[PDB]
Amino acid sequence: ENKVINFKKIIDSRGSLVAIEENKNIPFSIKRVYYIFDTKGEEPRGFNAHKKLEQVLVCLNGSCRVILDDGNIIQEITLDSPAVGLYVGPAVWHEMHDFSSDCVMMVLASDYYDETDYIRQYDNFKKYIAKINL
Amino acid sequence: MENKVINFKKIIDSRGSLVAIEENKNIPFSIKRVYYIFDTKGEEPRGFNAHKKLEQVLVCLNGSCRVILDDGNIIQEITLDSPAVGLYVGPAVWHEMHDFSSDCVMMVLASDYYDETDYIRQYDNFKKYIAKINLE
Numbered sequence: 001e002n003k004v005i006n007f008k009k010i011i012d013s014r015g016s017l018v019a020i021e022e023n024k025n026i027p028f029s030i031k032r033v034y035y036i037f038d039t040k041g042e043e044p045r046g047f048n049a050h051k052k053l054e055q056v057l058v059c060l061n062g063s064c065r066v067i068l069d070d071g072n073i074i075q076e077i078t079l080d081s082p083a084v085g086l087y088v089g090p091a092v093w094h095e096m097h098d099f100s101s102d103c104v105m106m107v108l109a110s111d112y113y114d115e116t117d118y119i120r121q122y123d124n125f126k127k128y129i130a131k132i133n134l
Numbered sequence: 135m136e137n138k139v140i141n142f143k144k145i146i147d148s149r150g151s152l153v154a155i156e157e158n159k160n161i162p163f164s165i166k167r168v169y170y171i172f173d174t175k176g177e178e179p180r181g182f183n184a185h186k187k188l189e190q191v192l193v194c195l196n197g198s199c200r201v202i203l204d205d206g207n208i209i210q211e212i213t214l215d216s217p218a219v220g221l222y223v224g225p226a227v228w229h230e231m232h233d234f235s236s237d238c239v240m241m242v243l244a245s246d247y248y249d250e251t252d253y254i255r256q257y258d259n260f261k262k263y264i265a266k267i268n269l270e
C-alpha cells in the first residue's frame with residue numbers, strides 16, 4: 001500500500017487552498033477534526049493503532065516525521081506540505097516525530113474521540129493483526 | 135461573541151497544545167468539507183461573499199488574519215490569531231478575510247461540499263437577498 005494522498009491544490013496571486021471532502025478525496029466521513037500546535041520538547045507521539053478509527057494526517061505548517069505500520073509494512077514519511085495527506089486506516093499503528101517548532105499537525109477523523117479504540121501496546125497491535133489475518 | 139465567536143477547549147501539556155472539534159458538538163453543524171488557505175502573499179483580500187445554505191467555522195491555525203462579518207444589519211470585525219478560537223459564519227452572512235500574516239494558515243469547516251451555485255458574490259445582491267428574507 002501507499003498511504004499518501006496528494007490533494008488538489010489551487011494557486012493564485014493570493015496564496016494556496018486545499019479542499020477536503022468527506023468521501024470525496026478521503027475515504028471516510030468526517031466527524032471530528034483535531035490539531036497539535038505550539039509544540040515543544042523532544043518527545044514524539046502516537047504509538048498506537050485503532051480498531052475502528054480511520055484518519056488522515058496533514059502537516060499544515062512546518063514539518064513532521066511520521067512512521068506507519070500496517071502490520072505487514074512499515075512506512076516512514078516526512079510530512080512537510082499541506083497538500084499531502086496521510087491515510088491511517090484501521091489497524092494501522094502510527095507515530096509522529098520530529099515536530100518542527102512552527103509545526104501544525106492536523107488530523108481528520110471518521111469518529112469522535114474514544115480512548116477505548118486505542119491499542120497502546122505494539123505487541124498487542126501485532127497480535128491483533130494476526131487474528132485479523134485469521 | 136455570544137454567538138459568532140467560539141472558544142474551543144484547548145489542552146496544554148509538556149508536548150504542546152491540542153484542540154479538538156467534533157461535529158454537532160463543539161460546532162452546531164455536520165462537517166462535510168474542510169479546506170484551508172496557506173502560503174499567502176499580497177495585499178488583496180479573500181472572501182467577499184455570502185452563502186444561502188452553507189454554514190462555516192473559520193479558524194486561524196497559525197499566524198493571524200482579520201475577518202469582517204456582515205449580516206447586512208451590523209458589521210463585525212475580528213482578528214483571528216489563536217488556534218483555539220473558532221468564528222461561526224452562518225448563512226446569509228457576508229464575509230471577508232484580510233491581513234493574512236506571512237505564516238498564516240486559515241482553516242475552514244464547512245457543512246457541505248463546494249458548490250458555486252450557493253455563493254452570493256455581489257454585495258448589492260446580498261443586500262437585496264437580505265432585504266427579502268426580512269420580509270418573509
Ligand SMILES: Cc1cn([C@H]2C[C@H](O)[C@@H](COP(=O)(O)OP(=O)(O)O)O2)c(=O)[nH]c1=O
Pocket residue numbers: 032034045112113145152154
Ligand atoms: C486526540 C484527542 C485528544 N483529546 C484529549 C485527550 C488527552 O487528555 C489530550 C490529548 O492527548 P493525546 O495526544 O491523546 O495523548 P495522551 O492520551 O497520552 O494524553 O486531549 C480529546 O479530547 N480529543 C481528541 O480528539
Ligand SMILES: Cc1cn([C@H]2C[C@H](O)[C@@H](COP(=O)(O)OP(=O)(O)O)O2)c(=O)[nH]c1=O
Pocket residue numbers: 010017019020167169181247248
Ligand atoms: C473553497 C473551495 C474552492 N474550490 C475552488 C473553486 C475555485 O475554482 C477555486 C478558488 O476558490 P475561491 O477563493 O472562492 O475563488 P475566487 O474567489 O477567486 O473565485 O477553488 C474548490 O474546488 N473547493 C472548495 O472547497
